[PDB]
Amino acid sequence: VIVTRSGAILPKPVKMSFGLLRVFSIVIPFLYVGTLISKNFAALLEEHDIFVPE
Amino acid sequence: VIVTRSGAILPKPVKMSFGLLRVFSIVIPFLYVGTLISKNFAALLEEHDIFVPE
Amino acid sequence: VIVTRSGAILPKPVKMSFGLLRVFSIVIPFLYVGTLISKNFAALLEEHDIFVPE
Amino acid sequence: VIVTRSGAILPKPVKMSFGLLRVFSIVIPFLYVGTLISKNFAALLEEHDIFVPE
Amino acid sequence: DDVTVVYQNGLPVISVRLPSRRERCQFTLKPISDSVGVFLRQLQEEDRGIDRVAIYSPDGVRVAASTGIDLLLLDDFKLVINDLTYHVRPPKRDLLSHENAATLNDVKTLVQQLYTTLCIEQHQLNKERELIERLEDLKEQLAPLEKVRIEISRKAEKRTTLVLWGGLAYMATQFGILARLTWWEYSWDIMEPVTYFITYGSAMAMYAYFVMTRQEYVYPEARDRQYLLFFHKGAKKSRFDLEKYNQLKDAIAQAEMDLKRLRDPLQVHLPLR
Amino acid sequence: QQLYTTLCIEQHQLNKERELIERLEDLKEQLAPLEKVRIEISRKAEKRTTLVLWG
Amino acid sequence: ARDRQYLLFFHKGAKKSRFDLEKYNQLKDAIAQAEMDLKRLRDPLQVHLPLRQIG
Amino acid sequence: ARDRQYLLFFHKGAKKSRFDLEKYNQLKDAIAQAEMDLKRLRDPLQVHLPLR
Ligand SMILES: CCCCCCCCCCCCCCCCCC(=O)OC[C@H](COP(=O)([O-])OCC(O)COP(=O)([O-])OC[C@@H](COC(=O)CCCCCCCCCCCCCCCCC)OC(=O)CCCCCCCCCCCCCCCCC)OC(=O)CCCCCCCCCCCCCCCCC
Ligand SMILES: CCCCCCCCCCCCCCCCCC(=O)OC[C@H](COP(=O)([O-])OCC(O)COP(=O)([O-])OC[C@@H](COC(=O)CCCCCCCCCCCCCCCCC)OC(=O)CCCCCCCCCCCCCCCCC)OC(=O)CCCCCCCCCCCCCCCCC
Ligand SMILES: CCCCCCCCCCCCCCCCC[C@@H](O)O[C@H](CO[C@H](O)CCCCCCCCCCCCCCC)COP(=O)(O)OCC[N+](C)(C)C
Numbered sequence: 001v002i003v004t005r006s007g008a009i010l011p012k013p014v015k016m017s018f019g020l021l022r023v024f025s026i027v028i029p030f031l032y033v034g035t036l037i038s039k040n041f042a043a044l045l046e047e048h049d050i051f052v053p054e
Numbered sequence: 055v056i057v058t059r060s061g062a063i064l065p066k067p068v069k070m071s072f073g074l075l076r077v078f079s080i081v082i083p084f085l086y087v088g089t090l091i092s093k094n095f096a097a098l099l100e101e102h103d104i105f106v107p108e
Numbered sequence: 109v110i111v112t113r114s115g116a117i118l119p120k121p122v123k124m125s126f127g128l129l130r131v132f133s134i135v136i137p138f139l140y141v142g143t144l145i146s147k148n149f150a151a152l153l154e155e156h157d158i159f160v161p162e
Numbered sequence: 163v164i165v166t167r168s169g170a171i172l173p174k175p176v177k178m179s180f181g182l183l184r185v186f187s188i189v190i191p192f193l194y195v196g197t198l199i200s201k202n203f204a205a206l207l208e209e210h211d212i213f214v215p216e
Numbered sequence: 217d218d219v220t221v222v223y224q225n226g227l228p229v230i231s232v233r234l235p236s237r238r239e240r241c242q243f244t245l246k247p248i249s250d251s252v253g254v255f256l257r258q259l260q261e262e263d264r265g266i267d268r269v270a271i272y273s274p275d276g277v278r279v280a281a282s283t284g285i286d287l288l289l290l291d292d293f294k295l296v297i298n299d300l301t302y303h304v305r306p307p308k309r310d311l312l313s314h315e316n317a318a319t320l321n322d323v324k325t326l327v328q329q330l331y332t333t334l335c336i337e338q339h340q341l342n343k344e345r346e347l348i349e350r351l352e353d354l355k356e357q358l359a360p361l362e363k364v365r366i367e368i369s370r371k372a373e374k375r376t377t378l379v380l381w382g383g384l385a386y387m388a389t390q391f392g393i394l395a396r397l398t399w400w401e402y403s404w405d406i407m408e409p410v411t412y413f414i415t416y417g418s419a420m421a422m423y424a425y426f427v428m429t430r431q432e433y434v435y436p437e438a439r440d441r442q443y444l445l446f447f448h449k450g451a452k453k454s455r456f457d458l459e460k461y462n463q464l465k466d467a468i469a470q471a472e473m474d475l476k477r478l479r480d481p482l483q484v485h486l487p488l489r
Numbered sequence: 490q491q492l493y494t495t496l497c498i499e500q501h502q503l504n505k506e507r508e509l510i511e512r513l514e515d516l517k518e519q520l521a522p523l524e525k526v527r528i529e530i531s532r533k534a535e536k537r538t539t540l541v542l543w544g
Numbered sequence: 545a546r547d548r549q550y551l552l553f554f555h556k557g558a559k560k561s562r563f564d565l566e567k568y569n570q571l572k573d574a575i576a577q578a579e580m581d582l583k584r585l586r587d588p589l590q591v592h593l594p595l596r597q598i599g
Numbered sequence: 600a601r602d603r604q605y606l607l608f609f610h611k612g613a614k615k616s617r618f619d620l621e622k623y624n625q626l627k628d629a630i631a632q633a634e635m636d637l638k639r640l641r642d643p644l645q646v647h648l649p650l651r
Pocket of ligand 1: 015016017018019020021023024027395
C-alpha cells in the first residue's frame with residue numbers, strides 16, 4: 001500500500017543507519033571462523049586417520 | 055480461523071467429489087505421454103546424427 | 109505486533125510443555141524405523157537379483 | 163475474490179501493453195551479454211595460466 | 217392436491233392446482249405492490265376456463281378485492297374456485313413493517329425523547345468536563361510505570377537484536393564451513409549428500425516449529441514472538457504488575473474515545489455515535 | 490430544531506421504511522432477468538479456468 | 545492468479561455477448577444500499593434506540 | 600490446512616452426534632445482538648436511564 005484510505009501519503013520508511021556495513025562486518029569474520037574450524041576439524045580427523053579422502 | 059466474531063462456527067469446507075480419482079486420472083496418462091514424447095525425441099535426435107550418447 | 113490498539117502489551121505466547129522432548133521422541137524413532145526399512149528392502153532386492161549395486 | 167461486498171463484479175484486470183514482448187526483449191539480449199561476459203572471463207583466466215580444466 | 221405458499225429470495229410464490237389444465241401452476245407475486253384483485257386476474261388469465269374465483273377469511277366473510285397481499289398472508293384463508301375450496305395456510309410469519317395502530321407506550325417513549333432532548337445538552341456539557349478530569353487523573357497515575365516499562369522493553373529489544381544477528385552469523389559460518397570442505401579438504405561428490413540433507417533437515421525444523429508453536433515460521437512473526445517471550449520473562453525479574461498497566465492503558469484509550477465521540481456532536485451539532 | 494426533529498421522526502421513519510420496502514421489491518424484480526445472463530456468462534468463464542488449472 | 549484469469553475470461557465473454565455489466569453493477573449496488581438502510585432502521589423502530597450514523 | 604482439517608473433523612463429529620448446529624449458531628448471534636444493544640442502552644453519555 002502507498003496511500004492512506006483518506007488519500008494522504010504513508011510516512012517515510014525507516015532505514016537502518018549503515019546497514020550495508022554492519023551486515024558485511026557480521027558476515028565476513030564468522031565466515032572466516034567457519035573456514036578455520038572446518039580446516040581444523042578436517043586436519044584433526046586426518047591425524048588419527050579416522051577418515052581419509054582415499 | 056475456526057469461529058466467527060461471535061462464538062458461531064464456520065460452515066463445512068467444500069470438498070470436491072472424487073478428488074484423488076480425478077487427480078490420478080490425469081496425472082498418470084500424462085506421465086505416459088511424456089515418456090513417449092521423450093523416447094521419440096531421443097530417437098529422432100539419434101536419427102539426424104546429432105546427439106549420440108557414448 | 110507487540111501492542112494492541114492502545115499501548116498495552118500482548119500476553120505471553122502459549123508454550124507447549126516439553127516441546128523439544130516431544131519432538132525428538134518422535135523424530136529419532138521414526139528415523140531409525142526408516143533406516144531399518146531401507147536396509148531390509150535393499151537386502152531383499154539383493155537376494156532376488158533384481159537390482160545389484162556394482 | 164471475484165465479487166465486491168455486494169454482488170457487483172470487479173473491474174477488468176489492467177494488462178500491460180505488449181507485456182510478453184516487452185519481457186522477451188529484455189531477457190534474451192542480457193542473456194547473450196552474460197554469455198559474452200562468461201566467455202571473455204574464461205578466456206582471460208585460461209590465457210594467463212591460472213585455471214585450465216584439463 | 218392442495219395449495220402451498222413459500223417465500224424464496226424475499227418474494228412469495230403460491231402453487232395452485234387448476235381445473236381445466238391439471239398442472240401445478242406457480243405464481244410469484246409481490247406482497248406490497250399488488251392486491252387480491254390482480255391475483256384473481258392472473259388466475260383467470262392463466263386458466264380462462266374457471267367460472268369464478270374468490271378469497272374468504274377463515275370465518276366466512278369475503279375479503280375485499282383491494283387489500284394488499286401483505287395484509288392477507290398474515291393469517292390463513294380460503295380460496296374458492298367455481299367448484300373447489302382450498303384452505304390455504306401461509307407460512308408462519310410474525311411482522312411485516314412495524315406499522316400498526318398507536319399505543320400508550322409510543323406516547324411514553326415520545327415524552328422520554330422530549331425530556332432527553334431538553335436535558336442532554338447540559339448533561340454532556342459537564343460530562344465532557346468530568347471526562348477531561350478523569351483523563352488527567354488516569355494519565356498521572358501512569359507516569360511512574362511508563363519508564364519502568366521502557367527499561368524492560370529496552371532489554372527485550374536488545375536481546376531480540378542479539379538473536380537476529382546471531383542467526384545471521386550462524387548461517388554465515390555454515391556457508392564458511394561447507395565452502396572450506398567442498399574445495400580444500402574433500403571434493404563436491406562427497407559434500408553434495410551432506411548439503412542436501414542439511415536442506416531437508418532445515419525444511420523439517422521449519423515444520424516442527426509450526427507443530428510446536430501453532431503458527432507458521434515467518435521472520436517478523438517469530439521475531440515478535442521471541443520479543444514477547446523476552447519481555448514477559450523479564451517482567452518476572454522486576455515484579456512488574458502488567459495487569460495494572462494494561463488496565464490503565466485500556467481505561468485511557470476508552471476515555472479518549474469517549475471524549476472524541478462526544479465532542480464532535482458539540483462542535484458540528486450532529487447525532488452522537 | 491432538535492425538538493421539532495424529536496416530535497416528527499417516528500412517522501417520517503415509518504414512511505421511509507415503507508418506501509424502502511416498495512423500492513427494494515422493485516429493484517429485485519428489475520434485477521431478476523439479468524441474473525440469468527450473468528450465470529450463463531459465469532459458467533462459460535469458469536469452465537475455461539477449470540480447463541486452465543487441469544492443463 | 546486463478547481469480548485474475550477468471551475475471552479476464554468473464555470480461556471477455558461479457559463483451560462477446562454484449563451484456564450490460566454497468567447496469568448490473570449499478571443495480572446490485574442499490575439493493576445493497578437499500579438493505580443497509582433497512583438494517584439501520586431496526587434500532588429506532590424495534591428497540592427504540594437512537595439511529596446509527598452513516599459509517 | 601490445519602484449520603480446514605479441524606473444521607472437517609468437527610463437522611463430521613457434529614453430524615455423527617446430531618448436534619443441531621443451526622440453533623447453536625442462531626443463539627450465539629442472538630446473544631451477540633442482545634448484549635450489544637443492552638450496553639447501548641446503559642450508555643454513560645446519553646441519559647436513557649435514571650441513577651446517573
Ligand atoms: C552505506 C551508507 C548508509 C547510511 C545511511 C544511508 C544514507 C542515506 C542517503 C540519502 C539518500 C541518497 C540519495 C541517493 C542519490 C541518487 C539516488 C538515485 O537515483 O538512486 C539511489 C537509489 C536508492 O538509494 P537510497 O535512497 O539510499 O535507497 C536504497 C537503499 O539501498 C535501500 O536500503 P534498505 O535499508 O531499504 O534495504 C536494502 C538493503 C537490502 O539488503 C541487501 O541487499 C543485502 C545486503 C548485502 C548482502 C548480504 C550478505 C550476502 C551474502 C554473500 C555471501 C558472502 C560472501 C561469499 C564469498 C564466498 C567465498 C568463499 O541493501 C541493499 O539493497 C544494498 C544494495 C544491494 C543490492 C544489489 C544486489 C545485486 C547483487 C549482484 C552481485 C552478484 C554476484 C553473484 C554472482 C557470482 C557468480 C556469478 O539506488 C538504488 O538503485 C537502490 C536500489 C537497489 C540497487 C542495487 C544495485 C544498484 C547498483 C549499486 C552499486 C553500484 C556499483 C556496482 C557496479 C556493478 C555493475 C556490474
Ligand atoms: C557441527 C556440529 C554441530 C553444529 C551446531 C552448531 C551450533 C551453533 C549455534 C548454537 C545454537 C543455539 C540455540 C539457539 C536458538 C535460539 C535461542 C533462543 O531462542 O533463546 C534461547 C534462550 C532463551 O529463549 P527462550 O524464549 O527462553 O526459549 C524458550 C522456549 O522453549 C520458547 O520456544 P518456542 O516455542 O518459542 O520455539 C523455539 C523452538 C523452535 O523449535 C525448534 O527449534 C525445532 C527444533 C527441532 C529439530 C528437528 C529435527 C531436525 C532433523 C535433523 C536430524 C539429524 C540426524 C543426524 C543423524 C543421522 C545421520 C545423518 O526451539 C527451542 O526453543 C529449542 C532450542 C533451539 C535449538 C535450535 C534447534 C535447531 C535444530 C538443530 C537440531 C538438530 C541436531 C541434530 C544434529 C545431530 C548430528 C549427528 O536464550 C537465553 O535467553 C539464554 C539465557 C541464559 C540463561 C541465564 C540468563 C542470563 C544469561 C546471561 C549471562 C550474561 C550476562 C552477565 C550478567 C550481567 C548482568 C549484571
Ligand atoms: C552477535 C553475534 C553473536 C552470536 C551469538 C548469539 C546467540 C543467538 C542464538 C542463535 C539463534 C539462531 C537463530 C537461527 C534462525 C535463523 C536461521 C533461518 O533464518 O535461516 C533459514 C534456514 O534455517 C532453517 O530454517 C532452520 C530454522 C530453525 C527453525 C526455528 C529454530 C529457531 C527459532 C527460535 C526463535 C528464533 C527467532 C529468530 C527469527 C529470525 C532460512 O532458510 P530459507 O529456505 O531461506 O527460508 C524459507 C523461507 N521462510 C523463512 C519464509 C520460511
